[PDB]
Design a protein around this ligand. Structure first.
Ligand code: CA
Ligand code: HG
Ligand code: HG
Length: 279
């Protein structure tokens, strides 16, 4: 399949070169997979989700996304126009309030929720979770992310937006999950992107167009935007049978565009997520 005039990040993920605008992908499009978006929620009624999104959990007075961030991230995973895996099922877990804030205890509860909740969902091709959140180093937060991964969910987490070594942030610093840095449309490391040995992969993170609340759309930036490109890619590859939850991060790194990004600090991987799709 070919989607012309796609957001640059989608085009980038299916290209050996920057500077193109068509997204190419196998028509299976993540059908039969599921992606949890652990964030401020998802506006499931957005036309872009086509009935494939639902809220499954909140820790607040409402499950509505009153911020937009979670809706944007979900859009990059699986909206019809702005998404990587255009046929995946999307499940929203609201661990962040409408200010985008969440106590670590609530975030941890949300991760453990997903590890169990996948047993209540139909995801024959596999399960992914996108965590576009983070804070300072916490062994408890890392351990929760590790449990989620161990349970059979491909966990993708934001590296963080501090232009610093991600070793000092959680869940970014957890070795067993997929830690995602951000790049821009000219294949430069995004200026805010964290880096370091704990990163596994980069994805498009600067000036990313996606869904927003009130049935709208918005371009924003962050490692929070790169993460769902990787999460959607994992779901897409799992539907194709190319990899599994336990191996998807490694597979994505194995098959990435290599050595093509600029301003990658010495010691950080130079790997950009790539679907290796041949139309
Ligand atoms: Ca990993
Ligand atoms: Hg967002
Ligand atoms: Hg995004």
């Amino acid at each position: 399949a070919a989607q012309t005039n796609a957001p640059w990040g989608l085009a980038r993920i299916s290209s050996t070169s920057p500077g193109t605008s068509t997204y190419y992908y196998d028509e299976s499009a993540g059908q039969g997979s599921c992606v949890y978006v652990i964030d401020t929620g998802i506006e499931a009624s957005h036309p872009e989700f086509e009935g494939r999104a639902q809220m499954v959990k909140t820790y607040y007075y409402s499950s509505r996304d009153g911020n937009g961030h979670g809706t944007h991230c979900a859009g990059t995973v699986g909206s019809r126009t702005y998404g990587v895996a255009k046929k995946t099922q999307l499940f929203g877990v609201k661990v962040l309030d409408d200010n985008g804030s969440g106590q670590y205890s609530t975030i941890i509860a949300g991760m453990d929720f997903v590890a169990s909740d996948k047993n209540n969902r139909n995801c024959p091709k596999g399960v992914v979770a996108s965590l576009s959140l983070g804070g300072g180093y916490s062994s408890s937060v890392n351990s929760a992310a590790a449990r989620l991964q161990s349970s059979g969910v491909m966990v993708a987490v934001a590296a963080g937006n501090n232009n610093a070594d991600a070793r000092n942030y959680s869940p970014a610093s957890e070795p067993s999950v997929c830690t995602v840095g951000a790049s821009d449309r000219y294949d430069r490391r995004s200026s805010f992107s964290n880096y370091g040995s704990v990163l596994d992969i980069f994805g498009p993170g600067t000036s990313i167009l996606s869904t927003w609340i009130g049935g709208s759309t918005r371009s924003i930036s962050g490692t929070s935007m790169a993460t769902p490109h990787v999460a959607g890619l994992a779901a897409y590859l799992m539907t194709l049978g190319k990899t599994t939850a336990a191996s998807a991060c490694r597979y994505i790194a194995d098959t990435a565009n290599k050595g093509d990004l600029s301003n990658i600090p010495f010691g950080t991987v130079n790997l950009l997520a790539y679907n290796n799709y041949q139309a």
